[model samples]
Structure formats: structure tokens, C-alpha cells
Target: AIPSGIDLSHIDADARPQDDLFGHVNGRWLAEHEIPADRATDGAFRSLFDRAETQVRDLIIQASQAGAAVGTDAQRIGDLYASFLDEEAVERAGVQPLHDELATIDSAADATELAAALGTLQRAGVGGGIGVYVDTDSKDSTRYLVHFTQSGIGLPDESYYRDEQHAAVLAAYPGHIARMFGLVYGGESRDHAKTADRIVALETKLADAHWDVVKRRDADLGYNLRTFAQLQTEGAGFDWVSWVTALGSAPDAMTELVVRQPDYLVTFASLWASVNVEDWKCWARWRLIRARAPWLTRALVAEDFEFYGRTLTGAQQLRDRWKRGVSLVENLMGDAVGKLYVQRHFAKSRIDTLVDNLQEAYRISISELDWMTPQTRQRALAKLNKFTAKVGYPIKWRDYSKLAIDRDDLYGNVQRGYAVNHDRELAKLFGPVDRDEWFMTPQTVNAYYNPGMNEIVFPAAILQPPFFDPQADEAANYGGIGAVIGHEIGHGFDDQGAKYDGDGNLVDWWTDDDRTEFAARTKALIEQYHAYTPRDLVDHPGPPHVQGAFTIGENIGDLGGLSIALLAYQLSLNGNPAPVIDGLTGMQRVFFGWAQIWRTKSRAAEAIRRLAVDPHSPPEFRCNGVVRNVDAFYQAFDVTEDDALFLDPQRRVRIWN
Candidate 1:
């Protein structure tokens, strides 16, 4: 009884609902499907990504073939694509394109000279001594301020170096670094081993000074505001004025700034003079080569893939070169390329209709809350009313007129692209908050709830196929994209986002009793998820365990999102009997749609790594864990004590009002 657009092949009718609901819905499909060789995971999102990537590749190919005039968007796009595709020219150029940067590193005599060199690299988006960006001041959301955070490490996380479980990877890391540097600074030089040892030792020292992952999640704990003058004195060994200026901005661009991790700054400052100048040069040199590896010759790109894609995530093969090349172009000129994508793929009518339905559903859910007091309810309604929806694409596309692209030199083109983006961030330092800005491009297949801006954004690419269709079954859309929309909306009222007011400033708007009630409810949800032993996705060892504490916010979101989506679907019925589709009731179809949309399979390495880092639970848990707590789920399936997911009303927790 599968619907037209749904992937019915994934359903396992023989799978017992009494034990595991997620396995029942997706077990057959997971067994039958093989994850693509180039991918670490495969599912609904990846399928969308593949389709979008193919479309983007076609656009890039068209751009490259266009006979447009020089300096136009098309010409620049063509040249950028050509520069990456021309492997012969890239190989011939070899390390020659990097000689100028190598010379600069060699000329640096001491810590002071190295600081300037680091700033130059940092400007072009290379990993360096410090990280800086512009954002809405959490205290005063009207204007922007420069924010400094901990960065400059090569690994995915600090745990990679510090954790006992990752000791084997740590042992192999130095050899990997040595191999990359050996490719650049001559094969098997004596300096290569020495350089790798120094870099790892230095990074470990910084890692010790870094904040814990849990501590970093709290906005209040992370924010430490200071004036530029205080920053110079606090983070002393480096030249702040010169370094800031070298990052393509004047010192005056920043007045008040936030230091996200103060302890890391102290350690970084001390290491400025303590770490040998030769070590700094070696590190910087390697970073420069590493940053440009993808745009370099085939050999360097292969080496990078061998380590990052194969060794790190277990991707069986490198993605076809055209796919990577097209992705690079999209990253560089997304707004420009996205304009074409929007024109071809997006329809204003689709977004217009979706927005209306979702808004109506959101309103009904908020107004009917029984757990909230009148005062809290009033403010919550106001916040809900203030919620903004951005669909399809931005009203204004980015202007890349100043960015330069060289058809003959891929490395130079990448550097110019980085500089352009870095400059854009710096320019935000002294301006009114750009409310119209988008963090993601239109061609992306993801959505976000940005608490700082108090908005839910949906890119054009996610508005197709399995997640959505103008003519698809109503319950399917409600279960698929409707749940996704509700999930983002749920984030606005989740633990972290509840701290921000409707104006996007950090302020408490909840009554003490209501806040306490919310906390207690979310705590129960945390324990429920922590109990799960997540399944292994691939042949690798270690069945990853969910960290309930780290993923509480997302857990709350999953439960809340589904509840709201179900309510919305019922409201949409409008007193009429829901039309039975393919022998399934509307409620049955709703739950089925939710399960099918999250169909996923991950490689063992990717699954293990994500458990340690990702804020969201695995897809199986997202579906099964969410449904078990839902009251409607029990009614739909006629659950009893004998069923695995049966929960008494008293034990089931609710965070959504």
C-alpha cells in the first residue's frame, strides 16, 4: 500500500512493530541498498544532494562553454571552472604557484615576523593563529561586532588528539602530516619528521587550553566581551593592530569584540614566542599547501582524498573529478550560480502555498498549549508571530564583481575567492545587521533555524521530490517537509533559543515555574535517548552510543516537531474525513511518511565519528525514538504493554507547549 512518490521498497512488512519500529520501516531497504562508493552515507538527504550536484555540474559546464565577454559573471564562472578542470596546466605549474608563499615563510626571522605571515594566510581563509568573524552582538542585536573563537587545529575535534579510543588514529596522524609535507618540501627530508612532531605537540598544548565541548555550547559561558585595547593587553604576545590590519581591514573596524574562548588566547599568546620560529614556518608552509590541495594537480588532490575521504570517512573511491570541480565553483560563486538554479528549479507558487499552510499549522499549535501560563503564553505567541520565513532564495544576490579569477592558475583563483569571502565578513564589523543575509546558498538541500536572526530558512533545493511536491499526497508532505519545518520552528523554543527574545537579543522571557517545568521535561528526554545502543552501519567495529547530554536540544526538537506536524495535519482536515489512500488511513500515512523520509545507511567510521561530534542522533533514533513518545502513535498502531515502544502517559515527557 505504498504511495506514488514514496520509496516503498524500503518497507519491511515482516519486521515486528513490537520490537523496533525503525527497523520495520527501513530494514528491508537498508539491506538491499549499497552506499555509493564515493559516499560515506546514503539516504534521502544524500539522494537530494546527488540530484542537486548533477544539476549544478550541468550549470557549470554551460558556463564554461559560454562565449561571454571578459569580467562578466559567466566569463569568471567559465574561467574558474576551466582553471580547476585543466589538469595538465595545474600539474605543470606544480609547487611553483606556492613558491612566493614559501619565500615569505622563509624570510620570517622571529615570532613577530611569523605573526604577520600568519595574518596574511588567515586573510585568505587558511588555518592560522586565530579565528575572527562578525556577527550580531548577543547583548545588543542591532549592530554587529567582531567575534574571536578557538581554531587553528587540523583534526575534526580536540578529542581526536586527547581521547584514549582515538590513540591509533593519533599514531597515524603524524605520518599523514609527514607524507603531505614530504610531497611539498621534498620526499623523506629529515625536517619532515621533526616538523610533524613539533606540530602535534603544539596542537596538544593548545587542545588542553581549549574549553570542553559541553561548556562551549552555553552562550553565556562562551561570551567574553572586551574592547580592542583590552584584547591587545589580554592576548599579549601578538601584534593585534598589525594582524587585524593585515586581514584586509583597519583596526577601527572593531570597537567591541567577543572572545569566545579566553583560555585558548592565553595559551596561543604564550606559544607565539615559545614554539620555534622554524616550526611556525613549517606549519604555515604545510597549511598553505594543504589549503590549495583540491585545486592543485591530480596527484595532490588524490593524496588529499586518500587521507581525508578514504582514511578519515571510509569513502571507497574519490568522487568523479567533474563533481568535485562543480562543487568548488558553487562554493566560490554560490549566489551567482544559485540565481540560475532558482530560475530553473524554483517556483514562487510552491513556496507561497507552503508558507501559508505551515504558518496556519504553527499558529494552531501555539494557541492550543495547555502547559503554559497566561503571561508565558502571551510572550510565546509574540515570539511565534515574530518568526520570519525565508524561502527559495534571498531577495538580494551577492555581488562578486571585485573577486578575480585566473583561468591558468587554480591556486591563485582559490586564494582570490577566499580573500573575497574573508573581506565580506570583515565588512560586517561596522554595519547595521544585514537582516536579508543568508548563511546558506539557494542550491543547498538543507534548512536552518537561526536564533540570532529569529528566522527559519529553507533553500530552494529542498523543495522537491520526496520532501515536497505540489501535487503529492497531503499526509506525505505533512510528514516529510512539514516535520522538517516544525523541527526548525521547534529550535526557536528549544533550550538554547528560548534564551533569546523576539528581537533576537539574549533575554529570559519565561516565568520561573514555567522554565523549571521545561527543564524537568527535557531532562527526561535526555535519559530516554542516552539509553539507546546505536547500531553499526558498516563492517567496522564499535556500535556507537548516543550522548544524551550533547544532543538534548535536537532530541527535544524531534519530539516537538512530530507533535506539531501531527496536529497540523489534523487541523488541515477541517471537519472532513481524510481520504483513504492506497488502503491506509491518513494517520497511518503520516507516521509512515515520517519513517520513510529518514531512511539512512552510514559507513562504520562515519557513524562512529558522528556519535562523538554530531548534535543530532542517528536517523533510526530520530524516527523510532520520536514516535514512541507520541500519543497519536499509540492510537494509530493500537499499542499495548507487549509492544516495545509502549509508554504510560506519566512516563512520556513533553517539552512543547
Candidate 2:
């Protein structure tokens, strides 16, 4: 017998679809399952992530036993994995590996020397006062550009320093920093606490200079292109020449760069001069130790976990060492691991066909929009036509020939990985944009849409049950991965992504009236999500609510994705009546499928932390908040005004189609 695509056994009998579709579909399972002590949250995503992790672990272990030739991908992967798992060696090394890096911080005599030291530390994956990276110019899309963005805050973001709701975390952070310093420097507890206080004060000033999260999302304001000379003039107090020189690139080599926050840089310059020199050294020393703590001795690892894992997030226990090892290998040599991952767990071409269906669905819906003018509609269609879909894996895998991995030197291997990756990024500045590059690896259980590249990417690991099952009911597939596909496609036209045109250039392609109408529709969505409060925040002081403005892009994506997926599902039927699966109609199953995938339970600390930082709404709102505006959901479930989930027809918001 064929299994129904819906999980009927997990449905809650006490809930009604009209009042709570998410609860009706997933309540039983959410209630029965306990979030693991080592995890912040658990749901469909985590379930699939666990499966992918195990598979990759098996592949890595095989490579370790295969004894492949030196310097090959297999050899690198095996050696990197073995080095991380060698706990005894790590314990013996203690903090000896970080001694050289710490000396660089200790030797800095002035702000200019400190600035140069920061640039070197940045290449080693340490965060200092500023961050520099290379990527395609948002405005030009044809050329590579170096971008400088605000950094150096130890907390999640600026909000953690100022927001009243984050008071608990703010109070706990200094103690965490003091303890870390004590472990490294072996100073008096009072002396370490004083150092921690000074570091916190400096970071607080940085946070104050930071543009808020919502302001940073604006593509238009972020693109401040300047010549190297212009940066030297505008950013006067800081030593830009020394910093750029230390990054292994001549100051003259950077003809132009993008400064995301000019004001932050200017403010940072003042702070750099105003703060005590010894205090800056303390902060620099802390940054170096913090970055390397995870790969260091057991004491440092446990301290790192105590603050970041157990305190910031609500995990009650640490992950197994092997799991942590697997994660490190995935991050450092993702493409190398992914190369092996695809060879063993590749999917069929069904996902490619699904992309085609979603694209056609988006086209039909966009052409039919009554709100957009003919000129804007044509441009949207053109962008859609040029949109690219990357499935499974990249055609060209990254070459790890330059990245040296040692079987015994775990810390050295990690440092080398950072240097190799940084060098690759720096090389892009002198060349044209690499359109073939992928931001994610095939083994990742996620998908994304890059506005700069105008592309939608789906990794191989995400193509599994509940997301994309080849044999599942057609409607279920559409509602599951179909919505995900539409979600990514919708991102190109979302609040932020809509600014970029077909060629991935940031330009306003909409007329005045069309832009106004789009804003009015999205305004409704922002207001809707703003009213939602995470369940875990009910008892907290001044309980934080979802920042609708912060989450507008994702809200638009959710609304557009689910709406377009339903239309695509109906189109797949070719005018025939849909089948009944598990005593439910096709439309009902679509909504249920969407609801089932968001089944999640979260801890209070994690929930609060994400509210301050994450741009997406909570799982309940992602399922319920989106469905209320979807007209098809009303018809499928017979929802009326009396139901908790019902929204008036005039109030329903639809932007895409």
C-alpha cells in the first residue's frame, strides 16, 4: 500500500484547521517530542539536518580509512577530521598554539600598529573593529568590489546593548568575558574583571555607532562607493593605510571600495583614538582567544560552551565531540566534503522539473497582477526569465590544493583554512565576478536566493521527505518544496530584493504608482507579524514582539511563496479535479503539508535571542501568520469570521500573485 504524504498519525484531534492549521497538523508531535538538551530548537529542519550530519559523518570516516594520496581532497578531509578528533593532543597543546597570536597583540605600541595587527587577525577569522571582504558590486554586478562593514561587538547585535528586553543577557555577558580572560591570562579575578569591563565599554561604544538592524538592510543606503584616497580623507582618525597594507594588499591596489556605514567608520576612528592603548590590547587579546577557543583545550572549550551555548542559547548540554568535529570539517572543507557527499547521496532530475513548474507559476501570476503597471510588469517578467536555478551541486568544486591540512595540528589547519579562504576572496578584487560560485555546499539542508547573482539555489540535502519526495502526492510536494522554491523566487521581488533589476544591478525599475501599491500591500504584512509575540516571552520583562520591519522580506517571501505554490499545484493538475488522499482533498493536503514542515519547539533563551537578531518570524507565525492572508486556505478549511485564523477579504494582502 502507498503511504499518504500527510502524517495523519501526528494530527491533534482537539484542534481545528480553521482556527489553527499549524496546531491541527503538528500539535501532537510537538507535544510528544522534547527538544534535545544539546539543541536550541527541534523540528522538521533539525530532523533532516541530523540525518544529513550522520550521512556526512559516514563519508568522512570512510575517507579517513581509505588512505587516499597526500594533498588530495580525500586526504585533506580525512586529515582534518582526524586532527579535530585527537583530543589528547589538543589537551597537551593547551593554550600554547595561541601564544604567537597573543604576542602580536601584546607587542602593539600605538594605534597604527594595533590597526595593522587587526588586519592580520581579520584574515585569521578574528573580529576586530571593522570587517573587509570581496564580493560582486551590488550596483554594477559585473565587477568585484571590496566592502567594509561594522563589526567588533561581542554580543549578537546592537540591540543586545540597548534593548530593555535583553537586560539579562547584557548583565551576564561581562562575567562570561571575565572568566574567559582569567583562563587565558591567569590574572587575579578582580584584574580580569576590570579588563572585561573596559572591553565591554569599548564594545558598547561600537554598538552605539552601529546602524540598527532594520537600517542596515536597506540596499540603497549600504552602497557608499569611495576611492582609497576618499576613504583616507573621510575616515581620518584611523590609520587606513596600515590596515590595508597588513591585509596583504597594497593600499593602491584598492582603487575603490564600498563602505557600508560611513558614520560607523568615522565613529570607530574617534573611539580608536579615545580608548586607552592597553584596553585596546586587552580587547584584541580577548578576540584572538575567543576565536580559537573552540579548537583549544577542554577547559577553554567548556568555558566557550558555558557562555555561548548554555547561556546565550538555552542548550542544557554540549554536543558530542565527534559531532563538533564533523561540523568543523563541514565549515572548513565544505566543498571537499560536499564532493564526497554528492557522489553518495545524489538526487534525480525531479527537482529540476519542479523548478520549471514554479517558474512558470510565478510568470503566470505576475502577468495577472492588477496592481502593477504594464511597464513594471514587463521588467518583472524579464527578471523572472533571467532567474537561474542551481540544484544538487556546483559544476566546479573548489580546489583545496592551496589549503594545507595537518593530521596533528588542528589549530594550524584551521588557521591555514582561514588564510586560504581569505586569499581566494581577495583575488576576486582583480577579476570579474564569478557567477559560477555557490554560497552553500550540496550537503547543507537549506536553500537560498542571492539578489546579487539573481539565482535560486537548492542543496542536495534539502531534497528529502517532507520537503521534496519523488513518490509523494503531487500537491504535497508542491506545498512542501514547491513553496520553498517559490519562496526563493519571491525573494528576488521581496521588499529588499526588488531593488535589484534583472542583471542584478540595484536600480529602481518601478513607476511611482506601482511602488506605492507594493508598499501599501507590504505594510499590511509588517503590521500583521508585529502583533505576534513568541509564546516563550509571555512572562519576561517588557516581553519583546516580532519586529515587523525587521522581518518584512521573509514575510513577503512566505506570503508570496505559499500563494504561488498553491497556484502551481493547481496548474499541475491540468484542469482535472484533484484526488483525495487520507480522506482529505488536495488543497487541504497542501495546507497541511505546509503546516507539518514547521512543527517546532523552542527554548525561551533561544527564542529571545533570535527575536533580537533573526529576520524571520517564529515557526507558529510562519505557519499561522502566512495562512491567514492566503485566500485559498480559507476555502480549503471553510474558515469563517468567527475562527481565530480568519482575516476579512478586504484585509487580505497579496503582493506577488
Candidate 3:
């Protein structure tokens, strides 16, 4: 009497699968479920996140009670967690901890001094006019390089500031800024309001100069390697040397850096001098307060949430303090937390086997692509063969021995954590690439494909029941984690990831003709997704639609992932018929598994906000938008021409298989 892995209770008998697969599978659940007051959206991911959050909280409590020695991972984790929960201590400290940094911003009298101040704050994870990080050089793939990208805007993207549809949010933004400033200055004054207005105007100019989400996606355009001399020459006004020196690195340390938005840098340089120094100080001060507000006292935290959570995302209430504390600890020292999370929750071998099957399925898929020529197919196969699957956690956990944490000073602990992390990244600038590094933590309820490493990573937390269950029917397992694995694998051949080769170098291996054919197929996918409007936005004037170009990488992943998952499931059967479970055939259960995993409901504001920034489509679209194009889904349900999900066979786009 094993329960079905696919939640049969969630299915709606009234809704036909062929007409609307997502609704058919998740309609009952969606109808009954209410998004939690503290959450912007609720579904399978949130369910898993809640579980992980609670688990980590328990772990943190245990660490705190253990009385571990100083410098030990447990001691640091416990102290950091303890400091965040000590409200009285935090409230008493108030804005005193930020006094030194705010004073630096206020004292900046010229562009040179301003740049230095921006650099110092940037090290503490505050966004200035530019963002800098160390990553594997896109073109070389062997050496680490410093990367600078356009930043400084507070809103989600440029569209929020410029688009008329988001005018309401734009108008309210300054008031929120002024409110935050008033908390620091101890009064709500006209001066604070003016500073807020000036800050917003500066950010708007930066946003206008910045590349749009769609433009930023182009890997080729983003990789502009330049030396310090070239950076000064092209982007003249800013004192690059002073900025780099204040950022804790010698200017010569950046022998070469990748400027992702050179044009934006050029524009920023002009604005650096043209904008008043006082306005620059206002903007820098606001960025500092905004970045650290969550870790400060209750008043600041509540004010921070009022705009970001309540206004922007429609979250009715702040998350419980413990949840936020868990998040802070996780972000500051995730690997230390992840090291503990894996030992307690992860079963590594099961996921390893799943990854193996998915890899083989991709091999079978790439080998059989009728659209690809033999030469191009060979390159694709080579790339697939080179793919590395990292499961559960990193082979080497991040060392937090040097990071200082205090049980009483929450602000100091956070600032020290930021400095330690910033130094770690900067240290990488001169060293060889750490192939063993992981961008995500083990407790993260998600997965990723790192094109630079030609690898796919699935964190331990995502490998639970809905995504992976050892006892689940093979059909359901394949449809769940199997598709996720395929999705990550699909990223290797997606529009952007395809730009990188088997060696993880950013060089095109495709024949020109093959490249053209690929673009043509993706163009159809873009148009299909572009037509899908978020369900919540349907009634609104000039509602934001899914930006297919911005989301094409993920859309391609979804389409290819589902396709390969079905193929992998069939391949696992070795031509034998799959046994029926709960009167549902194997293929039917596969689609059902995927649809159920994406059973999500989001608030209107959150849904609209995602359209502007999230690279992934809406949950409904992720299910329906993907399944409609999956031929196996149509075949599984006997979809007819009259059915809403039906697509003409010729019109269906297949890129991976």
C-alpha cells in the first residue's frame, strides 16, 4: 500500500489534461491553497524551502546550545544566529554602527574621494554605481578575472523606473527612501525628502545608461577584457586607481578585468562628474542604509520590509524572526550550514544514479537530432561528454575559520562576514580557477548549470519527495528530478550556454548553418512565450507580458528538459511496458509529476515584478507553456486539434532532440 508519488488528490477530474495540463493536475490544490501572509508566492518550492528553513533553525539551536569553542564552525554559526535574534542589543546599538561608513560618504568632496568611498562600501556588499566580482575569464576559462557590471539602481530593473505601467511603484520609491533616511537622521524632514528625490534621479540616470536584461544576456557582447590603462582611457572621469586601492586591492592587481558593460561605464564616468557631489553622497548613503537595514534594529527592519516586501511583492506580513535569522546565517556562512545540512538530510547515491540516467538520456537525445549535421552533432556530443554532475554538496567545504562573529554585535558580525567574503573573491583574482567550488549551498532548494565549468549542480534540499524519491514509481521519479537534471543539462545547449565549448571556453563550435537553424527554432519559442501574459496581469492596463528574449535560456531549458525526461523515462524501461500505477499510465504520470511540482499561486504584485526581472516564466507557464510544446504530453493524453494544448506537429519546436 505505498502511496502514489504523484499526489492524486491534487488532480481535478473536471479539467481535461489535454486542454490544460497544469490546471488538470494542480487545479484542486490551487483552488484550496492560500499563499501564506508572509510569502509572496506559495507552492512546492516554498513547501520545500519551509522544511529546509525549519531544519536549519533546529541545527542552529543545537549549535548554540553545544557550547562549541571559538573559531569552530558551530561556534561561529551559533554566535551569528544568536546575535541576529538579540533584538535589545541590536536596538540599543541603533545607527551607531553605520556612523563611520555614513561619515565617509558625507565627507566625499570630489569624484576621486567619492569613488574611494564607493569602493570601501562595495567591499561590504553595498552596491555603488558599479559591481565587481571575480570569476573565470569568459574567453580564457582557465584564469580568474575581475568582472565589473553596471549596478546602483534600487528597483528591480530599469523598466520599473521608466515604464508607465510601473509609475505607481516609481512614485512611491522616493518616499520609502526618505522614510529610511529619516530613521537614521531622527526626523522626517523636507531635507530628507529632497535627498531621496536626488538619489532616485541619480539611480534613474544610471538605469538609463545600463543595459537591459535582454542585452545583458548576450555572452559575446558582455565579455570586454580591458586593462587599467584602457579602462581609464575609455571611462575617463572616475579615478579607477583610487577606487581599486580603497577596495583592498592594488590597481596593478587587476592587470586585466572584464567590463560587462563598457558603454555603461563610459556613461557612468560622465555622470560621476556631471552629477553634484552632494547628490552622489546622498545616493551612496542611501545604498549603504538600504543594504544593511535588514540586519539593523526593529524599526529599520520593519521600514525596509514595508516597501520591499509589502509594496513591491505584496507580502502581507514580515516573515517570523527565526526564519529571517536562519536566512542571515545561511547567506553569511552557507557552506558551514551546508556542511551540517548534508550530513543530516542528504542521500547522495540516489541523486548520483538519477544524474547518470539523465546524462545518458541527453547522449541518446543529441545523437538522434535529425536537424543537426554530423560535424555539429559531434561537437555537441563532445560537450555533453565533458559535462560534470555535482550532487549534494561541494567536495571541499568553504573554510570559515577566519571569519569573526560576535554573540552580541549583529551589525559587526554582518560587516565582518561581508569583508571576509569580499577578500575571498579578491584572493581568487590571482589564483587558478577552483573547479571544485559551488555557487549554491547544499540546503538550497534549487539547481543550476554553470557553463564556465560545463557542470550541473543539484543541491541536497531539492532532492526530496516531489523532485526525487527513492520509493517513488520510476515513472514519477523520472518525470520529477529527471526533468530537473535534463533542464540543467539542457542549459549546456541553450542559447547562451551554447556559446561556450566543451572546454568551457567562450567560443562557438557550431557551424554557421547550424547556428542559423538554432536561432530560427529559438525564435519560435520566444514568440510562443511572449504571447503568454501572467494570469494576475490579465485585467490590468498595458499588462506586462513575459519577455521571451530575457527568459529564452530558461524556456529552452524547460522545453528541452521535459522532452529529455520523457525520453530518459522510456529509455530506462528498455522497451518493456511501464506498469500502471493508480490506473494512470506511465506517460500520464510523468506529465502529472511535472505539473504538480509547479503548482504555485503568487500575488499580483509579485507576478508583475517577476515579469520584469525573473529569468524563469511564471509557474503556470512553466507547466503549461512547456507541456504544450512537449509532443509526449499530447500523445499521453490523446490531445485532439480542438484541445487547447494541441499544437500542429510542424509548429512544435524541438531543439535538443
Candidate 4:
């Protein structure tokens, strides 16, 4: 089943340029990649795009979702877009929408101020959602699905409130070629005044609503970190009793539970006291408008194509039909998007077993960590072992049955899908706990871990290709999939994940010793990534996204994963000769082969898109960064400090020995 019938020792590295990030990545990749048949092009970059196409991101917008096109569906999806881009309405009333939430917080009284605390928990993690915890692989289905259905914006993700370069790029539209360049990238002249001004206006709004620094910092504490009652004092600004009752918890029970959580309390009080509900609410409405308007507005799409896509992906003609289709759909069928999406994609059978292996690994690893004291380890392991695993699919597929799909309204289907599905999932809080329910489908290649359930999930979709192969020797199979497993398991112990006990409640699950060790050990990884540049933008003026505190768990997973995966691979090799694949020995292949999986090209526009929001290291760094820390690769390839693959002796992110 493996495409390249070769062995393990092919793509080994020699050295890389210290200053040239892109060149360093391009150099190593160009020297050693093998093109597979199932791809659009031969190189690693194209290979990734090929795989992404399987997910339909590459499908022509017109073909995949009519609302994604420029004609009928485009018009329908466009109208939805118009509602979002109603700049006057958004700018004027944006602050108004969250007023009720602020009022809700105020009424809860002095006994409990958990309104903010509950919001903190709910929004915790890089891409927050209980579903992300239930899916792990980026290759398959993930929380990205939620994002896709929701995103129909005209601009590249970077256009929001950040980065001068993209702001400059977006400013180029409606101006002559040279004038456009200066406005978007911005040098001295204001030749394109209108475009430049619009970007500035967007930036101003972003600063108006960015999350307060303190709240963002405390986000590392998983939602369950506070006791229900502490959740009260912390949640005091909001109606505690009402909120809990709605979320399906008894007020007394929530109160008692918040007090009993076994975790750190040092900085929480300060954080709980810091959030300004009004500003935070503005941010919420802004993000919602950002997500929803893009999918539905045609004029916005055409403008977006001119601003972001042309430079990033090399587009000569903007798809007016894209918005037209969406408009038609919005005009006709609403709420049908989520309903039809699953039937065409998502497989459950393939995902169940992956979750089994992932949870087992976590259970074993937790029980065995030497750093923790026995008492702490008992609780950690209890949580790990008891932690649930839901794979492939949920026992209850979301009820699209209630939403009718029509061939005529392309955009309406998408809107209806979003609206109905949003409420439908929320309705789950009232139902009996359906343990068999899966957040991600099998065909989707992704993984997640839910703190509430102490659960970890992996879907069947991610089990393919560079990650999992039935024909590849166990070394490759485990190297790819096992590394992913290690990554997910590591999430439970990441700076953020460690705060939760196995029960999924926000509890401090660490011993003082383990906590200190974790902090000290992970400092290297933090420092290393912090040094790199994220050369793109978001919609606002935020930092270049090395959100050290925010993304701590993902970073921890990246660093520790090399060692865990290596150990897992060794366990699988029961004397089989490391097969020679990609013209290298088994060990050599493991390193570069893993890198191969990460191969693929991204539009420059998209590059900035991720810079503001994505919490992980850039894709290039994901490969180079992890391998540099991996001693196993060093031993196999004779890599050393002078070797390009080696981490600088002074600058390694050494969470694991």
C-alpha cells in the first residue's frame, strides 16, 4: 500500500542557513523530497496542497459550495456577506451587542463573580472548543470544519487588525498597480488614500476590542481550573445560578465543586478581577462578524480577492460568482450547510481505534512519569485512565434532519446549517450524557482532547498518508502516527492541560515538584520559538503571535513528542531490520519522512492569516524545530552542532532529555 517501495534511509540533512528561514526550509526540502502519485505536484509543498484538496479547500469555490461561488450561490452567500460587512452597523452597534452579557455579569452580585471565569474556561486553548479535544490530526476533520462552515470572508485571514505588510497589501485594491503597492505595503506616499484609510479604520476597531492582556494570560488555566463557587466569586459579575442551570449544572453542586479543585491559586484572583466586560464583548461581536460576513458577501469577496489573494496566491481574476452563489443560497435555503457537509465527508469506523491507542498511551505515560510524587501521580493517572475516548464519530450525529436542503438556494443552506447547528449543539447540555458521541468523524484527519471529560480523540481521516500507512513498516507507521499520539497525550500535560484533573474538571493536578520541573524544563522551547519571526498579519496590530503563555501546551507537545514517539517506535520494532525508505536507513527516514508529511506550499496571504491566530509554530519550524531537539535523529544521522539539523548548543528547547 505504500507508494514508494523504497527503504528508510533516503532524505537526510546536512546543514541549513541560520538567518534564511524560508531558504533553510526550501533547501532541505528540495534536496530530499519524493513526490507521491496521489498529489497535484511532486514536491513536498505541492504534496500538502494535494492533501488539502482532498478536504475540498482546493475545490473550486463554485463546485464545493454554491454559496462559495460568484453567481447564484455566490450571490446568496454574498448577501450573508453583506450583512456582516455592513460596516456602519458593525462599527456603531458592535459595542452594543455585548451590553446584555455585561449586564448579566453585573446582576450576579458580590457572592460570586464567575461570569468572566466561565467565559475564560469556555474560551480556553489555542482554538478553543470541546471538539478540538476530540480530534487531533490536522490532516483530517478537525475544529477547522467548524471554522470553514463559518468563514466566508472576502479577505485573507490576515486582513483583520494586524501586521503592516498585509494591511499594506489589502490597501492596494481600487488603485493603480504601483499606487496599490505603496498603499498596501506602505512606504512614504499616500497615492492610494481610500485603500490605506480603510486599513487604518480596521486597525482602529481591532485595538478598540483586543482582549485585555491579563485575561489573555490567564487563559492558560483550562476552564475547569476554578471551583464552582470560586467560579461564583470569580463569576460574580454574571448571573451564576442562571448560567449554570442553563449549562445543565445545579447551582449548589457547581458552588461546592469549584472550591474543591486541587490546583494553583496564585495568579487566578488577579486575573479574575481584571477583565473589562465591555471591551471583551466588543471583541466577541467583532470576531463573529469577521467569521460570518466573509462567507456571504460578494462585493466583500471581490474586494478581498484584489487585496489579499492576488499577491498571495497570484489571482488575476476575482470570482464575483463566489458571492453571487452565497447570496442566492441565503436568499433561498438557510441552515442546510452543516446538514449536507457530513454525509459527503466524515467516517466513524476509521477513528474509533486511533482514540483507543491514544488514550492508552496517555494512561501508560501518566502512570509512569517519575517527576510526580506518588499521591499526585495517582490522581493524574486516575484522570488519564478514566479519561474517555470517543473516536470515528459521535453516537449522535448532529440533527440536520430538522433542516431541509434545497437545490435552489446555495447560500441559504450554509446559513441555515450554521444557525441551526449552533443551537443544536448548545441543546446538548440538557440531554443525557451520550458517552459514545464523537466530536469528529472518522474520515477527518485530526485529533482533540476535552478537559471536561479528560478525553482524547483521533479521527480516521488523519490516519492516512504521511501520518499513517498500512504498508509502511512499523517504524514509519509509528513514527508518523505515534508522534501524533505523543503530541495529543502531551496536550494533557501541557502548561495549560496540567491544570485539569482526569475528571475534566478544572483542578490543579500537579505536585509542587512536578510543576517546578515542568516550568524549568519547558523554558528552552519557549525561548527558542519566541526568537523566530512570523512574517505576516492578522486583522489588527497584535504581536507576531509567539503567544508563549497562550500556546504553551502545543509547544510542550512539540518538544516532548520527539522522545515519546522515538520510544514508542523502538517498542514496535521487534527485530525487523529498519527498512530502507526514501533511500535512507530506517532512522534517517523517520526524521525526514516526518518532515515530508509536513511538506506543502501556502499562499503568502494565508501565511499572515495564520500569524495572528494560529498558536502552533510555523509549519517549517514544526519540522526543523522538533527534529533539532530530537537526539534520536542525531544518533541516526550523525547530526551535530555544526550540522544544520542540530539545535544551537546555546538555544535548544529541551523539555525532554
Q: Could you tell me every candidate's TM-score relative to the true structure?
A: 0.96, 0.98, 0.98, 0.61
Candidate 4 lDDT tens digits, 1-657: 454422223333333423222333355444555433222124433443335334432122334344453434334333444444344444443233433433543444432443433333232110110111111112221221111011212244423445474556545432423343342234633564544344344334433333432233342322232445665565344454643443333554322221211122222233224444443332333333333333433433444455445554444564343333443333233223322333455424433454455455555655676765778778766766765655434544433344444334323444454444444544443444455666554434467866545676765456666676666565565556666777777777777667766555445666788788777766766766665554333343544555454455676776666566666555446776766654567665555545655555444445555554566667666766677666676677666556555665556555533
Candidate 1 local lDDT, residue 162: 88
Q: State the C-alpha lDDT per candidate.
A: 0.80, 0.88, 0.88, 0.47
- Model 3, range 1-657, lDDT digits (tens) per residue? 655689888788989988888888888887898889999999999999998999999999988899899989999999999898888888898889989888888888787998999888888778888888898888888999999998889999988888887888899899999999889988784558888888888898888998899999899999999998899999998888899988899866778999999999999998887878888888888899999899787889999999999989999998888888998998899999888887888658877887888888888888888987999999898999999888888998887877988898888888889889999889887778899999999899999999999999988888898988887788888788999998999998899999999788999798989999999999999999998887667988876799989899999999888889898889888999988889999998898888888888888889888888999999888899988787787778888899987889898888995
lDDT for each residue of candidate 2 in 1-657, tens digit (9 for 90 to 100)? 455577888888899989888888998886788899999999999999999999999999999999798988888889999898989999999888999888888899989999999888888888878888887889899998899999988888898898787788889888888888888878755668888899888898889999998999999899999998988888787888888877778775678999999999989888788888898888898889889999898988998998899888989888998999998898888998998889888845899898999999999999999988999999999999999999989999888889888899999998888888888888887777788899999988889999989999998888888987777788888889999999999999999899998889999999999999999998998898888887657777766789999999998898889999999999999999998878899999888888877888788889888887889889888899999988899899899999999999999888895
Q: After superposition, how far is residue 55 of candidate 1 from its true place, in Å?
A: 1.3
Two-way TM-score contest, 1 vs 2, winner: 2
Candidate 1 C-alpha lDDT tens digits along 222-249: 7789998898888788777767777777
Q: Weakest 10 consecutive residues, lDDT, candidate 3? A: 1-10
Q: Tell me the spans in candidate 4 whose CA falls farther than 4 Å from its real position.
A: 1-209, 212-300, 308-372, 410-415, 441-443, 534-550, 575-577, 580-583, 648-657
lDDT of 1: 0.80
What's the residue-level lDDT of 603 in candidate 3?
89
Name the lDDT value of residue 606 in candidate 3.
Answer: 91
